[PDB]
């Protein structure tokens, strides 16, 4: 072939087998059923308005509150004194 098979002006040919046709067809059928089930909403756009504003508001209060509660951890005496047991002996 003139150069680098798959890019360029003179590319080598590639042909569509029966595998690739049946694959593309069953993808189109799954797609067309997605086109069926998106054609019938349970609400209009007026009816859905504000139906989850409370839960979205409380969810962002949870994210906002998790953001504004970030601070260094507590420092204890028992950890620092607990280091002293590295020279614990027997007798």
């Amino acid at each position: 072939i003139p150069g680098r098979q798959w890019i360029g002006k003179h590319r080598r040919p590639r042909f569509v087998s029966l595998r690739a046709k049946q694959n593309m067809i069953r993808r189109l059928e799954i797609e067309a059923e997605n086109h069926y089930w998106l054609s019938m909403p349970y609400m209009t756009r007026e009816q859905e308005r504000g139906h989850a504003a409370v839960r979205r508001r409380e969810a962002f209060e949870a994210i906002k509150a998790a953001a504004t509660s970030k601070f260094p951890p507590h420092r204890f005496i028992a950890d620092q004194l607990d280091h002293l047991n590295v020279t614990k002996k027997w007798s």
Binding site: V86, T87, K88, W90
Partner: protein
């Protein structure tokens, strides 16, 4: 890798499960320094846990030596003569309980690669395949292009 390391087949010691189960671990040998931070969690293992361990399985005899060592060891010796020496150097008490329980649970086989995940000694029950299974006989045992 597996081609540089030896391999073996999955076995047991003396058919370890068939009649009765025998604990394969004979001796543990702790050597624990009295003064030394290396054998601290060993000492806390002897003060706390080696007695309850020694009672949970009485077929194991345990030798705590308590010499001035600089790295503490535990030496598991198994019924088949295998001796696995592992270090408890700077390990906490819980990690020595899981380590000693790990040595107790296993056997004196090598920890080299095991080839098959299974070991039947009677693999075939209906008779093994040979090329004359699934071939019908002919009359008088005749072969092709044989007249008489």
């Amino acid at each position: 890798t597996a081609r540089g390391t030896p391999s073996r087949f999955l076995a047991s010691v003396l058919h370890n499960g068939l009649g009765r189960y025998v604990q394969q671990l004979q001796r543990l040998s702790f050597s624990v320094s009295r003064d030394g931070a290396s054998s601290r969690g060993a000492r806390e293992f002897v003060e706390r846990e080696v007695i309850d361990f020694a009672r949970r399985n009485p077929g194991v005899v345990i030798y705590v030596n308590s010499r001035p060592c600089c790295v503490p060891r535990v030496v598991a010796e198994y019924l088949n003569g295998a001796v696995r020496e592992e270090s408890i150097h700077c390990k906490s008490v819980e990690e020595i309980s899981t380590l000693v329980q790990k040595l107790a649970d296993q056997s004196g086989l090598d920890v080299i690669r095991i080839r098959k995940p299974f070991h039947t000694d009677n693999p075939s029950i209906q008779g093994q395949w040979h090329p004359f299974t699934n071939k019908p006989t002919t009359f008088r045992g005749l072969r092709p292009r044989e007249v008489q």
